[PDB]
Amino acid sequence: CTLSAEDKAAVERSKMIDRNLREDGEKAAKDVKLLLLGAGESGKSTIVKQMKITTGIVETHFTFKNLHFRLFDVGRDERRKWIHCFEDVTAIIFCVALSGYDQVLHEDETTNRMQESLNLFKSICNNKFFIDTSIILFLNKKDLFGEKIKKSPLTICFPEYTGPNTYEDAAAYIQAQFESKNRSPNKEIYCHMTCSTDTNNIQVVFDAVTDIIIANNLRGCGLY
Amino acid sequence: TASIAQARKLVEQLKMEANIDRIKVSKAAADLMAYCEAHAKEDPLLTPVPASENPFR
Amino acid sequence: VQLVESGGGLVQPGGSRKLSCSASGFAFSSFGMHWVRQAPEKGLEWVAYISSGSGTIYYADTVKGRFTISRDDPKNTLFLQMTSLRSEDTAMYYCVRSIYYYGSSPFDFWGQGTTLTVSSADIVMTQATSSVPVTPGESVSISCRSSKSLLHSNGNTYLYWFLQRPGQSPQLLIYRMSNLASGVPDRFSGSGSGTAFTLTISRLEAEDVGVYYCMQHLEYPLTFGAGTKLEL
Amino acid sequence: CPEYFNGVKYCEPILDDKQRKYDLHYRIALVVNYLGHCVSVAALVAAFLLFLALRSIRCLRNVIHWNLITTFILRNVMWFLLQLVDHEVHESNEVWCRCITTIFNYFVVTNFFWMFVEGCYLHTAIVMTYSTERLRKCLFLFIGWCIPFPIIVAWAIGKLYYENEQCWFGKEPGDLVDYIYQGPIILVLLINFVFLFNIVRILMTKLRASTTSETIQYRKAVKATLVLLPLLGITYMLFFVNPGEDDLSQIMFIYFNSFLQSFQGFFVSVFYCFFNGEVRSAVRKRWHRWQDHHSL
Amino acid sequence: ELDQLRQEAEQLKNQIRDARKACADATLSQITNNIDPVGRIQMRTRRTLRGHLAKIYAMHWGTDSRLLVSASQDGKLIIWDSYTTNKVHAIPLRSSWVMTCAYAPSGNYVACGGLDNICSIYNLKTREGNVRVSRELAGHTGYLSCCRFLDDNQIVTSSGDTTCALWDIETGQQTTTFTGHTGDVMSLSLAPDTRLFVSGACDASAKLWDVREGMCRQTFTGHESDINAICFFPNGNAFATGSDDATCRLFDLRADQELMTYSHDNIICGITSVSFSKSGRLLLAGYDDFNCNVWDALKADRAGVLAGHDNRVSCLGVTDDGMAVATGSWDSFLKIWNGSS
Amino acid sequence: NPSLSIDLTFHLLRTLLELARTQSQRERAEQNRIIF
């Protein structure tokens, strides 16, 4: 208590700043973080256009009936050393395109967009920071895949696959190949097939994030 | 013509980096020894401070 | 930055008056607020203080129990309800903003002032010289003295030097006896021991005419200097 | 014949020894009860030290666990103090006997209220949140400690006025003043059971598509239930009321409840202090830090 | 004509390797045998700053050794008073991701940047009394990793598009650019005379750039992994780099090769922040195994350990007079270690 | 007849104190009998 008047006023100002930081943290705590990590040709622009209705990180604020989602878009990073920032996210929205098995890369090396997507998803699943986080997978461009699958058989993309050229069969096979990659029982891949014009995506995301939050609560309480 | 330009730039950079004067390791090690010996008594981390002089205590 | 006072006038003794201070152009809610009263032929006298956030309130000893300070942060307004007005209350009332943190400059802005006209343990501040006749171009050294040592254990010495120009608002000159106030030219300087202090002017100019006040800010209630006027 | 002769009521002596029941089963229950309390205290003191030496974990879960362990410790200490009472102090009423009975009853009510607090926190976590963590902590501490004081004081005042006899725990035909503190607790446990029932729903709905193996789902639900039972106080609800008339049933009553009551703090202490991953991680980290400091 | 260019480049790099093998008359570890060992360094935590609700990314000391800036993930830039644990300022930020922060040597401005690719410079002394945005610098296409104040007028910034830039805060344009890297440039460390600066990137090579001229002078490649932090030696002749391969190396400018490699067999964890002491005898390294290590810079032996954090140490700073060492980590605590007798 | 699980300890204590008082009273009656 052996302090001057200015020191006491400074301590009271520090208490005011403490209460302001506490109120800001209480406002911040009720928000859900989502990471939109995807490829350039993935069609994630269609995803953000469906969610809504600039070199820096894009921020999207969309609210459902009772929960507020805050989606972050990054954009051209070779090795993505900034991934440690996104440890605290509850779910990663990872979008891959179904129509990309035909088109090869610009480099013209013997690699496919689907194989690059599998390698990227394998790097995400094997990442040390993302062992707890779950993945929500969207299979975009159903119409283009459905059209192209009649003309082109699914042999060049997957040599091991030996099945008839059926839209449902091949789609299930691609979903199985994506679900095969994870080797951690903690996270669950929430697969959903989307299109250019859909309105159920917000519902799918709400149900999946609800499931992930309930599962996280149960795992924190020691039950699940 | 970007690859040949980048090659030329890296050649010019190695030309710049190669033509420099390099002091021997013993002389600069002696200089670092001298600096660390001369400034050894004014370092509070290296040499502990009494509690009356130490403002944090 | 603008502070405008209102609510003054001429009153009968025993009546009440709600004073207002209208703030604009700054963050009012982050600043503690001061009422300071100056008598017509006497020096400045502190009245009251309210902290930022209204958690902490200080009054003078004579002023305690009759005046109620309050503040409305969303309207950026300071209020002073005055009751039981005696003859000594007849004064110019100034509204003052002040922020307290390390490196800050408290008492850095003085209001315009409103006119009211009614029909021991405290540190005593002493300026034994009441006036000094000066000529421009010379170097002046005015002194102040406190009944208590103003050196605190943290190393600061809570002494402020103010200037009140004639017919204008007071102005901060030296805060904490080692720091130059913002906008003040560097010809002024402060130097003192624990109990005896000296404000030194080099190459005094036309605009340096006025009354100099010293002030202790060691402990509440604040007590001001008697004032040293500079004659031409 | 004399009426009162050497403290025996009467010249043939009339003695209640004929209307007597099996005594050795009560003594063996006493031995099991003392052993349960002693091993319980031996685990609880270690949990009390390992929830204060480790400052890495400071969430509200461990605070409510530490307060529950503290209430178990203090009610076991009061139980040991209360046990050393003979028939002389039971006949001739004394101040300290009634005082120790009152304090012990306070810690019993406090323990069941902290179980209610634990259930409320678990429900607030799993289902939905109603307030900020600071108001959670304040409300929880308030319910745990401040709420038992009026109930215990009112019970003590009513017991003092109406029935000032037999160190305030003698049951006479027609007593109704002992339901002041028992009454809420019987409700409280039921509320906890309702909370527990909701948890039994929420897990199973999550455990539907989680694992296709039905057997692992049933075993996991059983394993979760058998570790949520000791923490919520549903063990008392397992065999709540048994009629005195039956003999075998009465022996099962005494041994079963003596086994559940005595080792309950032991189960809670052991499982939650040791089996939790976080405490083991903290201990391992501090051991590595000590080894690193010693080696250098 | 690429073949003769690549052959000439290999010949030049062989010439540089031959010159570096020729200059290496003797090593540093051999001639420090006569020097007495430093011994045990008992340091204890004096103050603990707990105003952040999210992981702290960076910090920077003032020249008066009094105030300190700290940036956090939740979007706060808090300016602390280290002695009496009083919050002097708290700046709410536009982008929550801020990976670096700097404090002006005059003490007027504070900069901060992150994933938003914009360096925001705030002014601390205003007539309004409320901190506000003073300057926004946007001329990079990668994430801003580090920034340091040469002076109030000019700020050196390092970005994630393999570039460094000298900015003029008044006009708001790039004065000169530094494009010699191929990987993400993680940290820089100014010289005390502000003549040169060193820059470590993700190509496992540090460059020595000149501020005024704007061209690279020296290249140092002795790491097998990405360099995370760099700290220039006080006298103006050496520097030290920390990498993810559990090694931090002290390089010499005038010898144009490495001097010493600080590593340990039990440590297999990355280095996030390095810093020297006031004299330069103690090398402070913030490892990834939840504690910091105090190395002896002349004897290459582990002198002390700072173990007070629960999560990985992200940032570490030493005052100019070298009185105390502040460490920030991802468990949202700033701990001020100091040593007494 | 009401024998609650929560009130086990007081029931055991009352039964044991009643048995102890019956044993003490029977020994006191045997002392009175040897007096007679």
Author numbering:
A (entry chain A): 3 to 55, 182 to 203, 206 to 354
B (entry chain G): 6 to 62
C (entry chain H): 2 to 120, 135 to 247
D (entry chain P): 64 to 73, 98 to 383
E (entry chain B): 3 to 343
F (entry chain U): 2 to 37
What does the published report state?
Corticotropin releasing factor (CRF) and three urocortin peptides (UCN1, UCN2, UCN3) are crucial stress hormones that can differentially bind to and activate CRF receptors type 1 (CRF1R) and type 2 (CRF2R), which are members of the class B GPCRs. Both CRF1R and CRF2R are thought to mediate diverse signaling pathways through their interactions with several heterotrimeric (αβγ) G protein subtypes, including different Gα subunits, such as Gαs, Gαi, Gαo, Gαq, and Gα118,9,14–17. Here we report the structures of corticotropin releasing factor receptor 2 (CRF2R) bound to Urocortin 1 (UCN1), coupled with different classes of heterotrimeric G proteins, G11 and Go.
The structures of the UCN1-CRF2R-G11 and UCN1-CRF2R-Go complexes were determined from a total of 3,402,020 and 1,840,659 initial particles to an overall resolution of 3.7 Å and 2.8 Å, respectively. The α5 helix of Go is rotated ~8.2° away from receptor ICL2 and the α5 helix of G11 is rotated ~2.8° towards receptor ICL2 compared to this of Gs. The ICL2 of the receptor in the Go complex, however, adopts a loop and forms a smaller interface with Go. While ICL2 of the receptor in Go complex is four residues shorter, the receptor TM4 is one helical turn longer than that in the complexes of Gs and G11. The extended TM4 in the CRF2R-Go structure provides additional interface that seems a compensation for the smaller G protein binding interface with the shorter loop of ICL2. In contrast, in CRFR-Go structure, ICL2 of CRF2R adopts an extended loop conformation, which is in a greater distance to the G protein and makes only limited contact with R24 and E28 in the αN helix of Go. In the Go-coupled receptor, however, R2234.41b is located at the second turn of TM4, with its side chain forming polar interactions with ICL2 residues T216ICL2 and S218ICL2 and stabilize the ICL2 loop conformation. In contrast, the C-terminal helix of Go forms the fewest interactions with the receptor. The C-terminal residue Y354 of Go shows interactions with residues K2935.64b and forms a hydrogen bond interaction with the side chain of S297ICL3 of the receptor. L353 of Go-α5 interacts with the hydrophobic residues I2133.58b, I2865.57b, I2895.60b, L3156.45b from TM3, TM5 and TM6, respectively.
